[PDB]
Amino acid sequence: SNKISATGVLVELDGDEMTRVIWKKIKETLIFPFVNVPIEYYDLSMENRDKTEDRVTVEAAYAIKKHGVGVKCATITPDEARVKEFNLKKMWRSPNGTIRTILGGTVFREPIICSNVPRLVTTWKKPVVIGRHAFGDQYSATDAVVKEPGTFEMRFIPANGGEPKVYKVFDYKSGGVMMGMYNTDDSIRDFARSCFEFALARKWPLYLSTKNTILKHYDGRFKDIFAEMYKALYETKFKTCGIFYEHRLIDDMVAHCMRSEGGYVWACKNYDGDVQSDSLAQGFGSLGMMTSILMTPDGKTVEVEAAHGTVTRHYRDYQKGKETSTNPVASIFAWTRALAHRARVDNNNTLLEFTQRLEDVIIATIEAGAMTEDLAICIKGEKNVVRADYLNTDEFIDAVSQRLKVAMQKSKV
Amino acid sequence: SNKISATGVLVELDGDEMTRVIWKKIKETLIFPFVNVPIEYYDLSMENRDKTEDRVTVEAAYAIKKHGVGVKCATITPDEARVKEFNLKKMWRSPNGTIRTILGGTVFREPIICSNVPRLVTTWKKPVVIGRHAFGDQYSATDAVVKEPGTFEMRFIPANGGEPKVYKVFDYKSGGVMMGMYNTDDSIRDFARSCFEFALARKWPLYLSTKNTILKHYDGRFKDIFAEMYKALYETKFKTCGIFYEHRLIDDMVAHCMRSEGGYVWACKNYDGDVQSDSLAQGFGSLGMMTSILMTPDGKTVEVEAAHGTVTRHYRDYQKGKETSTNPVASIFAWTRALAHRARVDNNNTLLEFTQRLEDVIIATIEAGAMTEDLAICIKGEKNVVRADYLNTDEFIDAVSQRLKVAMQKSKV
Ligand SMILES: NC(=O)c1ccc[n+]([C@@H]2O[C@H](COP(=O)([O-])OP(=O)(O)OC[C@H]3O[C@@H](n4cnc5c(N)ncnc54)[C@H](OP(=O)(O)O)[C@@H]3O)[C@@H](O)[C@H]2O)c1
Ligand SMILES: NC(=O)c1ccc[n+]([C@@H]2O[C@H](COP(=O)([O-])OP(=O)(O)OC[C@H]3O[C@@H](n4cnc5c(N)ncnc54)[C@H](OP(=O)(O)O)[C@@H]3O)[C@@H](O)[C@H]2O)c1
């Protein structure tokens, strides 16, 4: 007679702009009509993080750290332009900058994938997640220009005070630039732990990639850490759930992304992941089809969200009058996924089977020919798509809504 | 009523193993039967590079210098387990090493591209090159592990005596790794010129790919140098030849690669192309299908060669009895496309008519049904393919040969 409970708690973390509007729909149309929902709500609207001098976000972030599952962060990283927008006040940072430094750990981008929609590499029969390492490599690494002849040396000084090993690297004829780059073991190691826990949780196998050939120490340290930790802390369980861990050269792995079937996690280093996640954002479909999943290296904590932004370009119209067909599917797949790690964790098999439901029904809806405007450009033509069988945001969410209400039905009696 | 002559001299680099076989019949069947030519023959055969303590290759390398065109270098970079092979003398190094070192400048890889054999991304209706950097980025840029808590500093020391500069980049709470990197303008200025000079002759546009946003001084430096240079030393001549130069973020430029049609040269910095070329080795067609033009920054000297190695695997047999289907199109393109620049240089518009012929004919050849086994796995099915539709190494070369003989004639009357 009732709905679907859960003993755990999902931290809701509200947004603003166009995402906020759609946030109430999927919330109201797809989630609460079927799910009982113990929620610790944190409003992150620009208005409201301002009121809270400094922030809600530190609260909300830690809230997530208590509960282990969080959902939304539709951001606003304000500008100087923005304060001018609605009388904001001094500074503010970026909400996610705070959360990702609080929770710590690593983000993983899962495409939404559907038979009818055109991948720019047709090969992909399943989605490929990518784990990118954000601690300083060349992201925290200085680099100075050189305007005269001279010598650039690296010097390692111990904190006891030994022979403070020196490095004659290069004496300049004339002109140029220089750089230094650093990455500690507990950084590399933490990043590994995450991958292992997230691949283990998504039931899929794991691939590393680097270029240790021409960086024998730096990138040798990655190969090492992962492979020992695999055979130390995961190996058997990874064996248990039928899922290897194999390292390949980046050379091999950008090709393997190209040529392989898909359905695995891929670990790339800090640089590589910026390069190749912006690659697969155009490739697998559109922004509005990926999510973003911050997992912790303990593997006990998740913040899921849509990969695409707090889409203002549409918010103009909203009810300034004109219709808009912003893609909710990444916003829904925010919740479905979140609910899943809530489900998985609480053992709870019932919500899980339901998140599985909604997801499959959103796939089935698009492949079934009713889709948003954004995908209607991909399926055929930029210059020749009219409002034939593609829907409004709302009409679209209804189309699944009704399609889920039959899936609810047909399964049980 | 005669063959076709060239004015200026071409320089042959005859190599060893399986390639040096095909090189005869390619060079017999297709080349001199229609083509007068000045060559200056280097046998770079182990046996005949062994004799010389201090190699033939330094004279060949210096040959090509003077002549501005050069053709073969199908290598053998000898071995520990190779000196054993055939009573060698000690070490030798690799030619491809030596030569690039003298000649200088920048190697460029262009896919051989035909309709029936598939690109592993269907977009590519044309061939795309790559210019890698290669030297002193991370290539000469050493690194060590940091094995205990302590500080890693950088120091530029001049070579006049002014105040030195100094950076406390990072201190290690414990453990890890460190790495610095250095890259002079003259290098960049060489990488740019080569590119610019090389697009210029191909009639193809240019895109760079860097990450200056996230490496301000280091990667700003290139975004810069090509800009000035274009408008300083190229642009209007590009404008003239309907070509151009734009820059895109590395992020955008692996993504553009995927979605762009093809027919433009692209430069990625030393890392960014050591990654992305193995990618396209599987990605566009096969090894056996790329070639490899070193062009000097002066834009005045060229060494072309096949991608793939001096394919020892297939040679074992040769007459050890059994047939073979090593794919010669690269080795051939390595004549045609050398015969191309030679022409450009002599402004011999007539010969150029010829190099065109044999590239177009090999296109015809394959599309029409004739292929070697390597493509007989690529069109379809390693798990079922037989000798019906795939020519031998040498029946294939005759397949072209007949067809060029129709072309040569069935055009000119
Ligand atoms: N940590 C961060 O910095 C972060 C992360 C996420 C968001 N944000 C915030 O989001 C705000 C706006 O971001 P932005 O406009 O720069 O990036 P964005 O929100 O992703 O929008 C850029 C373009 O993406 C398309 N798009 C976005 N969501 C879509 C959807 N659901 N369906 C279809 N198309 C969609 C829109 O295309 P068309 O309208 O052209 O169809 C839009 O023009 C910013 O104020 C930013 O601070 C910040
Ligand atoms: N600068 C350098 O150091 C350099 C560069 C190039 C080559 N080499 C030298 O070349 C020698 C052999 O190297 P390698 O055999 O590892 O590389 P390779 O000559 O490219 O052959 C390796 C594999 O590639 C495939 N292959 C190569 N050419 C082909 C063609 N024309 N058609 C179809 N498939 C082809 C073969 O595949 P299947 O047999 O599996 O079909 C072969 O097993 C070595 O002595 C190496 O040092 C050196």
UniProtKB/TrEMBL annotation, chains A, B:
Example GO molecular function: magnesium ion binding
Cofactor: Mg(2+); Mn(2+)
Protein residues bound to 2-oxoglutarate 1: T77, S94, R100, R109, R132
Record-linked Gene3D superfamilies: Isopropylmalate Dehydrogenase (3.40.718.10)
Residue span(s) of domain Isopropylmalate dehydrogenase-like: 9-400
Positions contributing to Ca(2+) 2 binding: D251, D274, D278
UniProt binding sites for NADP(+) 2: T75, T77, R82, G309, T310, R313, N327
Biological process annotations from GO: isocitrate metabolic process; NADP+ metabolic process; tricarboxylic acid cycle
Chain positions recorded as Ca(2+) 3 binding sites: D274, D278
Binding of Ca(2+) 1, residues: D251, D274
Sequence positions that bind Mn(2+): D251, D274
Residues involved in NADP(+) 1 binding: 72, 75, 77, 82, 96, 259, 305, 308-311, 313-314, 326-327
Keyword Transmembrane helix attached: no
Residue numbers binding 2-oxoglutarate 3: S94, R100, R132
Site (Critical for catalysis): Y139, K211
Binding site for NAD(+): T75, T77, R82, N96, H308, G309, T310, V311, R313, T326, N327
Catalytic reaction annotation: D-threo-isocitrate + NADP(+) = 2-oxoglutarate + CO2 + NADPH
InterPro entries xrefs: IsoCit/isopropylmalate_DH_CS, Isocitrate_DH_NADP, IsoPropMal-DH-like_dom
A GO CC term assigned to this protein in UniProt: cytoplasm
Cofactor binding description: Binds 1 Mg(2+) or Mn(2+) ion per subunit.
Record: residues binding 2-oxoglutarate 2: T77, N96, R100, R109, R132, K211
PANTHER family associated with the record: ISOCITRATE DEHYDROGENASE [NADP], MITOCHONDRIAL, NADP-SPECIFIC ISOCITRATE DEHYDROGENASE
Family note: Belongs to the isocitrate and isopropylmalate dehydrogenases family.
UniProt name for this protein: Isocitrate dehydrogenase [NADP]
